[PDB]
Amino acid sequence: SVAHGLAWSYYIGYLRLILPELQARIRTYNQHYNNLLRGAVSQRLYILLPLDCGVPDNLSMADPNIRFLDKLPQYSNSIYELLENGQRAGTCVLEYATPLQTLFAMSQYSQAGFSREDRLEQAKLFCQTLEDILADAPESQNNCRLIAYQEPSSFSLSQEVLRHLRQEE
Template sequence: MQSLQDQDDLIPRPRGSLPKMCAAVLSAMTIGGFLFLSPERLFAWVTMVILILTLGPLLHGLCMLAEEILYHSNTRHRGRGWSHVLPACGLWGKTLLAAGLAGLLLQLVRHPLPHQGQSWKLVILASSLYPLLKSLGVLGPSEVEVSALCEGRKMNVAHGLAWSFYIGYLRLVLPRLDDSITAFCATHQTSLGRGSRKLIILIPLNANISHKLNEEDDRILFSDNLPNNEIDRAGVRGRVYKHSVYRAHECVLEYATPC
């Protein structure tokens, strides 16, 4: 049997907020340094950088928008129009709002940046190069970023398998399981236990599932099968779903108590 330490090594923990904390500390240290060196132009520098970092993704979104409108508006977006395509390309929401506010604040700032003309040239050049570098994969997301995105949106393989198990099996058999158990108890002179009923799904860490549970533990004995459930599914008339009843002996348990 695997130890708890081995199980922790097999099952990855959900990713936390440490990258955000590190980014916040790094930004605070950098802004603090500029505040010490040039406090009168700090606000202008910050708005300029925000404008560069948001205008670049917006231009990249325009490049993606051209592809989506010309070739994929019907097949991928089903002709739902600009209200769907624009957010899908990142041309909506926080990025657009941040770019607009940064541009407005940069015009209203009291202490303009030195060499204002060159600063705007830098904005245009950096924003124009961003779509190229992004398209070439230089600024592409790392494997950790892709994994974190899939994990946050519940798009991992494990999530897909779980949904498949629920939609293709549990959603069909669970509504009929209670009646099957009642019918089994009536024919086998077995009484139902008191208290709430719980469904516990056992998933081995090594994905090795035995065909006979008594081969894994001789204290688990096969009793009988529940009555069959026949369900029309995927073009198959009367597909049979069945469950087996086992008797477990020498089960160690303890109720959780406050003290």
């Protein structure tokens, strides 16, 4: 199954390299660059895992309640404000799990012999494998949170992130 290699590549080649300095970079931002009133950026890296593997080109312009705030100083990571009831309800470092783009592309390539059913199953296995790797990983010190979801009826991505953000604090 492709999910196993995708989760290991993502952890080894990316997460284990960015997670150790993440809390220091967020701290730097909150203390020296953040001008929001009671808008401290949450301490975890929030990873969007749409199980449908639909990764847009621009995160921000996919939900009006998710607005780009700043680049996280010191790799390119972005800070977003999350709105609820028309007001800022939270701020976090947020991004899509790029290996889902591979699963989407494989389902779009007839020679891969990879159905939408195979894609959904591998997306769930990728999530489960990555969760398992991070649970045993020394770099993951209350540093990373996976946000896996499916669409049902309108969907609110901001509400999904906020439920995880509130689970932190």
